[PDB]
Ligand binder design. Structure first.
Ligand SMILES: CCCCCCCCCC
Ligand SMILES: CCCCCCCCCC
Ligand SMILES: CCCCCCCCCC
Ligand SMILES: CCCCCCCCCC
Ligand SMILES: CCCCCCCCCC
Ligand SMILES: CCCCCCCCCC
Ligand SMILES: CCCCCC
Ligand SMILES: CCCCCC
Ligand SMILES: CCCCCC
Lengths: 354, 354, 354
């Protein structure tokens, strides 16, 4: 909600509370999943052409006891936008690969999980410098593109930390699975009369910890190549994305896939009375994975499920949903070693937002 | 404060800063206790009869150094209210037992501590599904009731976690003392010309960890039976609550009382010039407690104190208070083993709220 | 921004997002430093003369992965202000020594680091009771003073905590380096036609942990004596502060300087077109430090650098800066033992604020 708008500056203070419950045989996801989000979008008018802006978003789990706190920053960035020249922002933000893969990240509860957070330039991560251009300098309507750089987020600097290695240290160190070296990426999208087409590419240097702490999927670089299609008109939403990755797709907590072929497709319709049915298919197929937890593998499913669900919108501030993950992965030594969910999940949600 | 009210949606952004200091011989409570609360109540008008709502409340300690952060969610829920039919909400919320026991939880600083948080269905906890009905479908003024369900909040799912057992795992695992199985509860209250009468009952299944990790007060279920009385009129506030519990009242960090008889009573008056004196008595008497930390017990006091204090209200946004816990527990092997405060505490508070 | 102003109460909900990056050979500070601040200043009008107020400020790091959360309260206090009599507030706040030393804490990114947080009464800390008087009861314009008390913030109360000692326990325990005993301080400042002069003194009792856990700089008390000068007019800002400390200046994580002589000086000019160049010098000279990490020392530099930089203000809501720490400390056994940064740092910042 816009809580302030005066002297060439406005502030949108937004958030949501999602009363959420998972039903599953997988007890590590079963039960109360209640959470909330809080954030602000701020925008100041410097000149007629120049805009300054800042955005921050925070998730706070609502399913924990008061003896603990599970919360985190999703995004936190500041930037400048000049009319028909482009925008530049820096901070924690979305990687440009998500410009295209977001087209399928529209399910009521699940979806969007052939990649993760702090996963190179595929979704949210630290230290993104992002240039964006809308309508090609105002010359070609519907033609957007983006060029992005991500600085290294490396190893821990404290010598007594258990994860300490001494290689690729940065101030904001973390575990190898959420590290990254210097990276560059770009996206291009074209919209025309409801139809949309998109491509995105990213190439990140991999850190020392990522290639020398016994994790699978080692190599000099992590790469992604994404193509996307969508139709968004007449209350119909169809979308599909195909991404091919190299040393970039996480295989649970074991490391990365040497190569992965990811596919997501979704079909949705929006009734005027408030109901919005959703059907989707997601798969991540690892290729030539090699040795994983004591056994040799070639091709293995990392993710594979059909998603059936529905959201009912009471209005723009209140909604409820059901989402049903029909999991098609088999329970095997690969999935157990990686700790990948292979059971079905039903989600029931009640959401207030402002 | 109401910071937004437009297009059938309003947002109350509220909070307080309590500059608070404890004086006590008990050094584990002595010293700076400064804290703050922040929250929002959001409400959207869907139709003339149907309201959607969401609420979130967060406590952040103000007595810690910047090298740490001690904060937590108190409540986080979303819901729907239909005129003369009832309300339904889900999330982290207050258990229905608190509908009656809250009548005595009105002291300046202390009180409200014959039960705790994440303590089955007695106060705040995760995964409450709560149906509420006010004025019996609009037919009997002053007659409210509630029916509540709490889903299991069980053991940790991570095999390498030190608290891991493998039994009763849920996604949002925690220590046995703050766990709970499936639970059901209800409350009924009747108000008439200042006088009030209330009853509440809860029955929760106890988890495996709760009955097999060496904690006292084991059994199939945790049960509470509460009766309450109050008078709230002519600037006078009197209230009393009696609760009898089975395997539900925590005896410090040792487990639970096999049986407990809890009693709280409070008398307050509100002068027009701003002063509000307060006198109260609280006791929790454990019955047939059995073996506790190497010794056999029958009846023992878990809690016993008189509370004398006063709040002065400068206005609705600013107040100050003194609260004096006159502790009647003796320092003995039981209280030391449980880690229960047995010394007197004086609290001085200065509170800004919005 | 003022998001509420009604019924004799107003609320300023403020904050900033700083997209920030450090370039340094020191890898423990190199990389993404993005962060945000959030806070509120609330003020209620009780009578024509009496004002009630509360303030809270929170920092949340924007450079971490979502698997962790690095945040903290900077200030959290409530208070009362009576016209021409003074103000009183209690909570987490700034020590009165900072009334004078803040005059040099005005650099784009660095500076203000001859002292730290939770460092006795020198900057932010827990449990400050602060009396402030502006314009000497309204009798002498430009003459301010302050009298402050800080309650003990001592050792941890949990017997199984690794930092447990059993001495000087308070409820809000923490590590010796951020502990303090009972302390008293005062400041006096006089402003006249742009020029300013200030003096401040603090004396804190040192805790048992501080003098018996193998830390350097032991003694009965921690003392500071500060003198300050400034000129703030005609778009020119000049300021200098000199502080002499005893058992109060932290030498990295090793303890404190027996004695320290701190000096900060800054010169800034503000162009109307938005640019604000900055040049500064900071030094902390330890005196008679004694034995430190196996070697005997007399005089050693704890801090020594020149700071060159600039801030460009697009407007009051958006700015960008560069800051260049030219580090004059040599890399030696003292600095390595203390873990003090001895390399140069360049900072680039883009800041949105509201
Ligand atoms: C022309 C308005 C009615 C359109 C009906 C849409 C049916 C969609 C079924 C998925
Ligand atoms: C096992 C208890 C299930 C609780 C259902 C909560 C539903 C909330 C969203 C409507
Ligand atoms: C009729 C107004 C005066 C009432 C005085 C109340 C005295 C209360 C003492 C506790
Ligand atoms: C030992 C120092 C006591 C500090 C008192 C603070 C009072 C704050 C509430 C008025
Ligand atoms: C009178 C307006 C112009 C003043 C110029 C200031 C120059 C400052 C150089 C640091
Ligand atoms: C303008 C502030 C943000 C600049 C970010 C620079 C990133 C450096 C990559 C090594
Ligand atoms: C196995 C039952 C699934 C039902 C979800 C709607
Ligand atoms: C022992 C002194 C108690 C005073 C509290 C008002
Ligand atoms: C060593 C290069 C420093 C430049 C900072 C402006």
């Amino acid at each position: 909600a816009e809580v302030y708008n005066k002297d060439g500056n406005k502030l949108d203070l937004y958030g949501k509370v999602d009363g959420l419950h998972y039903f599953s045989d997988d007890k590590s996801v079963d039960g109360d999943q209640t959470y909330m989000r809080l954030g602000f979008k701020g925008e100041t008018q410097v000149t007629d052409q120049l805009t300054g802006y800042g955005q921050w978003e925070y998730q706070i789990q609502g399913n924990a006891p008061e003896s603990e706190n599970n919360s985190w920053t999703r995004v936190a960035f500041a930037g400048l936008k000049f009319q028909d020249i482009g925008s530049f922002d820096y901070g924690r933000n979305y990687g440009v690969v998500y410009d295209v893969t977001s087209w399928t990240d529209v399910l009521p509860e699940f979806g969007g999980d052939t990649y993760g957070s702090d996963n190179f330039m595929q979704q949210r991560g630290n230290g993104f410098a992002t240039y964006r251009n809308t309508d090609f300098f105002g010359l070609v309507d519907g033609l957007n593109f983006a060029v992005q750089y991500q600085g290294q987020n490396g190893s821990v600097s404290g010598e007594n930390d258990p994860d300490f290695t001494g290689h690729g240290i940065t101030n904001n160190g973390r575990k190898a699975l959420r590290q990254n070296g210097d990276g560059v990426g770009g996206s291009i999208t074209y919209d025309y009369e409801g139809f949309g087409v998109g491509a995105a590419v990213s190439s990140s240097k991999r850190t020392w910890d990522q290639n020398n702490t016994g994790l699978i999927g080692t190599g000099d670089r992590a790469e992604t190549y994404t193509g996307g299609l969508k139709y968004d008109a007449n209350n119909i939403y169809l979308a599909a994305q195909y991404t091919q990755t190299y040393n970039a797709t996480r295989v649970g907590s074991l490391g990365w896939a040497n190569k992965a072929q990811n596919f997501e497709a979704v079909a949705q319709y929006q009734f005027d009375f408030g109901l919005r049915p959703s059907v989707a298919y997601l798969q991540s197929k690892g290729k030539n994975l090699g040795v994983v937890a004591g056994r040799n593998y070639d091709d293995e499913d990392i993710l594979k499920y059909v998603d059936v669900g529905a959201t009912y919108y009471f209005n723009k501030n209140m909604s409820t949903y059901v989402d049903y993950k029909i999991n098609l992965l088999d329970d095997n030594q690969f999935t157990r070693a990686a700790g990948i969910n292979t059971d079905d999940i039903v989600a029931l949600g009640l959401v207030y937002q402002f």
